[PDB]
Symmetry: D2
Subunit: 85 residues, 4 copies
């Protein structure tokens, strides 16, 4: 549960910057802007309340470029293999 | 992308890390997994060069925590976000 | 890649963040910058749709800090690494 | 300055896993394996000393996919524009 205050925001393009009530670190948010049941609200303004739920990224893949660079970061929903012996 | 099949370059199933060559594209993938993606059962490593399959999803909803020094202090899934109405 | 020219979608030069459409490829880019990449001089925003240039480098040498809960707790540049000899 | 101990390592492929002497978080390292002046040392083993220098990633670009996903993370060496007015 993350509660905080808008520093700046671009809801239409799905990103923003928030100061959480807890900890000492601000957060840049990116999200799919769209619909999930309620009518659209105004792009929030500096000082407005914002809430979200966050979860650790414990299951992921990092794609590595031919040059060794960071070429993507995905969620790993599942993985399977046949164990040796 | 959804389904990702490939072959194992290296694996450490005890610690939940692996390195895979996908059958598609030119980029290898490091994986970090828990029981969430791999299941509860204790499973030993696959052999290098054997098959491995997964399911992947783009991370579209995320937070980057920014440190006092301005660095990347954390990367999280943003499960839901809401704000006050104007 | 080196040189990256593009056009501004949105910008916040006061806080060191921006969003750019590169002239090359199909992917937009969010940038986070300090005086290290942007210079000391106070500069106001460019206009939306104007040109912007940068220089980029792949991050090949890095550390991912893993939290007690197994998450991504930090991402850093690894400037040098060494280990004991066998 | 980061000092720590090898948990596992693959020097030839340029990655590893370290427990730093400081803090409560382990670190997965990726690096370009190659030459920078000295002769090659053995892949380190569990319990071996490892050292490195780390720096915050303060100047970066994140590439966003057509689907909104994380499609790359680069270092931003510089950036320039003509300020409006």
């Amino acid at each position: 549960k993350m509660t905080g205050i808008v520093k700046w925001f671009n809801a239409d393009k799905g990103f923003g910057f928030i100061t959480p009530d807890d900890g000492s670190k601000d957060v840049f948010v990116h999200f799919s802007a769209g619909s999930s049941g309620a009518a659209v609200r105004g792009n929030p303004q500096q000082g407005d309340r914002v809430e979200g739920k966050i979860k650790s990224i414990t299951d992921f893949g990092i794609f590595i470029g031919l040059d060794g660079g960071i070429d993507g970061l995905v969620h790993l929903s599942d993985i399977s293999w046949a164990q040796a012996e």
